[PDB]
Amino acid sequence: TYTTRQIGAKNTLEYKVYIEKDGKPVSAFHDIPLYADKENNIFNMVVEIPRWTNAKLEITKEETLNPIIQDTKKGKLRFVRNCFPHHGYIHNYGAFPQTWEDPVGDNEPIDVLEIGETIAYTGQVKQVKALGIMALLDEGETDWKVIAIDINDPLAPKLNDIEDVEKYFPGLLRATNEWFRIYKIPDGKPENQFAFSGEAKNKKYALDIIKETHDSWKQLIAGKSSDSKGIDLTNVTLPDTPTYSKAASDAIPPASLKADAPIDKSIDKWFFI
Amino acid sequence: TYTTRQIGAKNTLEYKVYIEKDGKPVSAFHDIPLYADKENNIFNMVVEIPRWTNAKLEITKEETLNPIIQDTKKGKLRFVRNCFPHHGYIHNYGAFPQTWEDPNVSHPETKAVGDNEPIDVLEIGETIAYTGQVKQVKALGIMALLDEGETDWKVIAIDINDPLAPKLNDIEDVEKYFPGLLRATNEWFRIYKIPDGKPENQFAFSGEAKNKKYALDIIKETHDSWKQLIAGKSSDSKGIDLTNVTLPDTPTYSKAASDAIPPASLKADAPIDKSIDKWFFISG
Ligand SMILES: [Mg+2]
Ligand SMILES: [Mg+2]
Numbered sequence: 001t002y003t004t005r006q007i008g009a010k011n012t013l014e015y016k017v018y019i020e021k022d023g024k025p026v027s028a029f030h031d032i033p034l035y036a037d038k039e040n041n042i043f044n045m046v047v048e049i050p051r052w053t054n055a056k057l058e059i060t061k062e063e064t065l066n067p068i069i070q071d072t073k074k075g076k077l078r079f080v081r082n083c084f085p086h087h088g089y090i091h092n093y094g095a096f097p098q099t100w101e102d103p104v105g106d107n108e109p110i111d112v113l114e115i116g117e118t119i120a121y122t123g124q125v126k127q128v129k130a131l132g133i134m135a136l137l138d139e140g141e142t143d144w145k146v147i148a149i150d151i152n153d154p155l156a157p158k159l160n161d162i163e164d165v166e167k168y169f170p171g172l173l174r175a176t177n178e179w180f181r182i183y184k185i186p187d188g189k190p191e192n193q194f195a196f197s198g199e200a201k202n203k204k205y206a207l208d209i210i211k212e213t214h215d216s217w218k219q220l221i222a223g224k225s226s227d228s229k230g231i232d233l234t235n236v237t238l239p240d241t242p243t244y245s246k247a248a249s250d251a252i253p254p255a256s257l258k259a260d261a262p263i264d265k266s267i268d269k270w271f272f273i
Numbered sequence: 274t275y276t277t278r279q280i281g282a283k284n285t286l287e288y289k290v291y292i293e294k295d296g297k298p299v300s301a302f303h304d305i306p307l308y309a310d311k312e313n314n315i316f317n318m319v320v321e322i323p324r325w326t327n328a329k330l331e332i333t334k335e336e337t338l339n340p341i342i343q344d345t346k347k348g349k350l351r352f353v354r355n356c357f358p359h360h361g362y363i364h365n366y367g368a369f370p371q372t373w374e375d376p377n378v379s380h381p382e383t384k385a386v387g388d389n390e391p392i393d394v395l396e397i398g399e400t401i402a403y404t405g406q407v408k409q410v411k412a413l414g415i416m417a418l419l420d421e422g423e424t425d426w427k428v429i430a431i432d433i434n435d436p437l438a439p440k441l442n443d444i445e446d447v448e449k450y451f452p453g454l455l456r457a458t459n460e461w462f463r464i465y466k467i468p469d470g471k472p473e474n475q476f477a478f479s480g481e482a483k484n485k486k487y488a489l490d491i492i493k494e495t496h497d498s499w500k501q502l503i504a505g506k507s508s509d510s511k512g513i514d515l516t517n518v519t520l521p522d523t524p525t526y527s528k529a530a531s532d533a534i535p536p537a538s539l540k541a542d543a544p545i546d547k548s549i550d551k552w553f554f555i556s557g
């Protein structure tokens with residue numbers, strides 16, 4: 001059973017979320033199997049950012065057991081701004097564990113947009129099916145975005161491939177295109193671009209990419225990658241890896257006893273861009 | 274100074290929010306002056322629903338001193354559903370006090386009776402408001418919604434404390450600084466009850482946002498209807514509670530109605546059913 005352990009108050013620099021298995025912290029990058037069911041291509045997704053929130057929470061590749069923490073820019077907490085007509089992130093946003101875009105690769109686990117009705121929680125491990133994939137170019141890096149749905153979603157049986165997203169969620173792909181193009185403009189960064197004229201490639205294509213990034217991660221965790229520089233490969237479930245260390249689980253502090261900190265009112269603002 | 278008195282937990286049937294002056298409840302419908310500054314057309318807006326929320330909170334017409342309570346549908350808490358690409362309400366949503374959309378006459382602009390409540394207000398500024406807030410706003414224009422076949426004007430307004438307020442003087446300025454907002458507003462009020470099984474709404478003037486002058490004229494009309502209502506001279510006041518603590522010349526004035534309100538009993542927000550998360554895709 002997977003749960004979460006929160007350190008600190010939400011919306012502060014001290015905030016961290018670890019994934020626990022049966023009460024013990026494990027690596028959110030390395031210890032959560034990519035497949036919940038390999039034969040049927042059901043994946044475990046680690047959720048970082050709930051739909052309609054702003055705080056840019058991510059699995060941290062540099063910290064032991066890779067807890068989810070809020071991204072920072074020169075000491076300041078990073079929040080994506082509201083870009084009309086969107087409110088924060090427009091997907092449940094996260095990543096597939098045991099994947100790594102070998103750097104061209106963006107040096108992170110492959111990103112996942114989960115499109116189901118229910119709002120997810122930070123550190124949630126949910127099971128999803130892949131429907132398709134888009135290739136965003138962000139600052140000279142290939143930044144793949146897998147489109148997926150929670151297998152528990154009421155609509156999941158009716159969704160198998162990318163064309164079904166058009167049928168059941170008309171306009172979401174357009175919005176996704178737009179969002180990823182403009183979402184850094186309020187930060188003073190340029191508009192992003194997509195490969196393939198912004199087309200979402202189908203499930204078969206998505207599976208090939210996901211598989212590649214899993215194989216890269218297998219080389220990484222085995223200690224055989226060219227440059228694992230700045231990535232903590234500590235794990236507690238893979239006994240034959242060079243960086244296995246069960247003691248890392250017990251070194252994690254206990255759950256914090258703290259309410260969400262307030263978010264600066266500036267983050268409310270709607271930008272028309 | 275206006276403050277709030279909350280009874281119970283948000284998102285429950287017991288939840289109530291009274292507006293207080295000097296730590297004592299007053300009627301949110303009748304006792305808050307329409308104008309903060311009559312000469313400069315600065316209005317007091319009562320906020321019911323914060324931007325990007327769902328709970329359909331409103332001034333309760335039939336309850337003494339008209340606290341804000343969550344509306345219900347056949348006994349169950351009513352939440353407006355998320356209609357793609359929108360999340361809940363896309364404005365800070367509320368009303369002008371001391372107004373009434375008269376339900377007893379056909380309004381000439383829409384050829385429809387009024388919806389029997391205060392004139393509604395869409396406040397478009399950057400900061401998310403809170404329920405029971407009284408803020409000061411300037412009117413910028415107005416749209417003629419027919420909501421389930423009833424006259425249901427929506428005033429477009431901005432908080433005078435918004436950084437952009439000095440630059441927003443008339444409806445054309447909304448399109449300049451908030452491009453797409455008025456079109457989205459038209460869409461939102463057309464479609465928002467489709468997930469409830471209701472028909473699409475419509476607008477008079479093919480959804481045109483009329484200007485500030487037009488808005489002021491309609492706000493006056495609804496204020497005048499309210500003056501008749503509160504004097505006890507409406508042909509049909511619809512069981513509205515007219516109790517007030519500030520209008521001595523009215524037959525329902527009662528300073529001591531305030532004392533009878535229970536003390537605050539604020540509890541943490543109750544959880545909302547996960548179904549309210551759902552994003553409805555209406556067309557395409
Ligand atoms: Mg990522
Ligand atoms: Mg990426």
Ligand SMILES: [Mg+2]
Pocket residue numbers: 331367368390391392393
């Ligand atoms: Mg109203």
Ligand SMILES: [Mg+2]
Pocket residue numbers: 388420425
């Ligand atoms: Mg209405």
Ligand SMILES: [Mg+2]
Pocket residue numbers: 388390391392393425426
């Ligand atoms: Mg109304």
